[PDB]
Paper text:
In contrast, 4-O-acetylated Neu5Ac is expressed in fewer species and has so far not been detected in humans. N313 is one of the residues of the conserved VSN stretch and closes the binding pocket from below. Interestingly, the O-acetyl function does not contribute any polar contact and instead induces the tilting movement under the steric influence of the bulky side chains of Y315 and P323. This interaction is supposedly not favorable for the binding; however, the steric constraints bring the O-acetyl groups of the three sugar moieties into a position in which they contact each other by means of a triangular hydrophobic interaction (mean distance between methyl C atoms: 4.3 Å) that displaces water molecules in the area. A similar effect is not expected for Neu5Ac. Interestingly, all known complex structures with 4,5-acetylated SA display a similar arrangement.
The HAdV-D36 [name] knob domain (FK), which mediates the primary attachment of many HAdVs to host cells, has a significantly elongated DG loop that alters known binding interfaces for established adenovirus receptors such as the coxsackie- and adenovirus receptor (CAR) and CD46. Our data suggest that HAdV-D36 attaches to host cells using a versatile receptor pool comprising sialic acid-containing glycans and CAR. Sialic acids are recognized at the same binding site used by other HAdVs of species D such as HAdV-D37. Using glycan microarrays, we demonstrate that HAdV-D36 displays a binding preference for glycans containing a rare sialic acid variant, 4-O,5-N-diacetylneuraminic acid, over the more common 5-N-acetylneuraminic acid.
Author numbering:
A (entry chain A): 179 to 292, 297 to 371
B (entry chain B): 179 to 266, 272 to 291, 297 to 371
C (entry chain C): 180 to 266, 273 to 292, 298 to 371
The structure:
């Protein structure tokens, strides 16, 4: 199974940061055996975070992908599942996938939050944190935090959360339009 | 198709930073279905950018890989095509499966019709000599070139911002990235 | 397309300061000529379990040493008991070793040897907090210990001043490298 689960090529806004349809998430997940190879980028098109500066607060927001136990996207997700499907060479434009457990983050590697020091649960392991760059400009750093299975909303079985933000002080407003970020994670199966 | 398209892993000088073949670009592209997994590193061997310090300007340069509509490297590229080929000296005829998607990364009123300028770039620190106190940067850009009537392009911008009074070689740590494939 | 790993939820399996004082989670997945990797470290006891600006040095090394069949040597910081293919200890994993052509063991300007290409360097973030950067350095084939044929070394550290002590508990880090075969 070398398939890809992705945000579909429809050019419409597909995601909610603050309100419905205010952003365009690009996400591709490709199965490489027991690891998923991923690339993600975000463009906020309208609303509070479309153009940012130091007077905007807070300087972080969250995009949640919540999945049930078959790996299907739940309607409480920030991503509109209208735009979430397997990439295909055929015409699955109108056929939603039924199962994608092999694309879910492992709940053994990344367990949901729930005395021996050797039994201490890692707080870092379920997160991937890096700079991204607004407009792809080296002098416009922001950040991305990818989180695995840290959500409980909608009785989800699995979750992938993207927290986007920034810390550098910006006087002139700049679009929140991120460079693409590559990451990988251990798959459920 | 799980093949690799690369420079070979230990290339002779094959790339132009300032003058032809003044550097060694090691680049491997591995097809994982419709996403490409890539690793890149650059050693400048001669000329202006072989040994850098704060007196060198400008502190950024561009390496363009330009492809036709079959995914074949055009001779106007900074990278020499002589040993750019599949891992296996007959030149390849087709590599469209390794090109960056022009739907995901297209060439350059309604806010819902706004186009992302960030998504076709990957920006990160790299570290000269692999030392944590010698940061530089890399910018990978997909399909942003139009030279030589290219159908696809991958551009690497390398540079640095930190002040280096004691000179050091422009010799990058390896950088991993991925991108959505054309097919 | 197989995976070689520590298992995804390992018990203490790694030596930072003393044996089994830390939990290294490492998965290597073969994608043809490249290996795709994810790594994270939790130090659970000892000097580096809870770090601060008084701790020195602010860097330590975790060495994975392999013989010519890609089998982990006992001199490695990582214990080999649960280092195996995902589902008997494995007999061969040369396909998971970093290339000695891309990343030669240490030994005319057009014949200068790159010092950077065998290293991958990035920030990781302790507890996954954006305000707690540390760093990771991955090094290929740079060790000579135990007459190893291949090596992967992880140097972890930090530079930011932390006056309030915090666990050395890294965010996950993804990298890739050219495989030996
Ligand atoms: C002044 O400090 C920064 C900046 O502009 O904010 C820090 C930034 O790095 C981080 C991690 O934010 C860095 N970008 C990269 C990709 O290295 C730039 C860059 O080096 C110069 O702009 C080149 O002239 O310098
Ligand atoms: C002083 O600031 C820097 C530096 O040397 O320039 C910034 C640099 O980070 C960036 C993004 O350039 C950082 N390197 C990493 C990999 O984190 C080092 C490092 O923390 C110390 O050298 C350890 O002693 O510190
Ligand atoms: C003040 O400087 C730092 C910090 O806290 O040390 C630098 C750090 O980046 C590096 C390369 O270490 C950065 N983290 C990321 C992931 O970008 C944070 C962050 O932007 C703010 O904490 C948000 O409020 O700011």
């Amino acid at each position: 199974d070398t398939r890809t689960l992705w945000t579909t090529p429809d050019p419409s806004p597909n995601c909610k940061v603050e309100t419905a349809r205010d952003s365009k998430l690009t996400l591709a997940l490709t199965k490489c055996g027991s690891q998923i190879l991923a690339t993600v980028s975000l463009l906020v098109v309208t609303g509070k975070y479309a153009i940012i500066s130091d007077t905007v607060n807070p300087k972080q927001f969250s995009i949640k992908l919540l999945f049930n136990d078959k790996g299907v996207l739940l309607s409480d997700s920030n991503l509109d599942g209208t735009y979430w499907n397997y990439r295909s060479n055929n015409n699955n434009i109108g056929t939603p996938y039924k199962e994608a457990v092999g694309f879910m983050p492992s709940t053994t590697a990344y367990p949901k939050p729930t005395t021996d020091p050797d039994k201490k649960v890692s707080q870092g392991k379920n997160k991937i944190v890096s700079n991204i760059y607004l407009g792809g400009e080296v002098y416009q750093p922001g950040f991305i935090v990818v989180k695995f299975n840290q959500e409980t909303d909608a009785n989800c079985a699995y979750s992938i959360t993207f927290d986007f933000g920034w810390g550098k002080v910006y006087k002139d407003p700049i679009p929140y339009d991120t460079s693409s970020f590559t990451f990988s994670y251990i798959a459920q199966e």
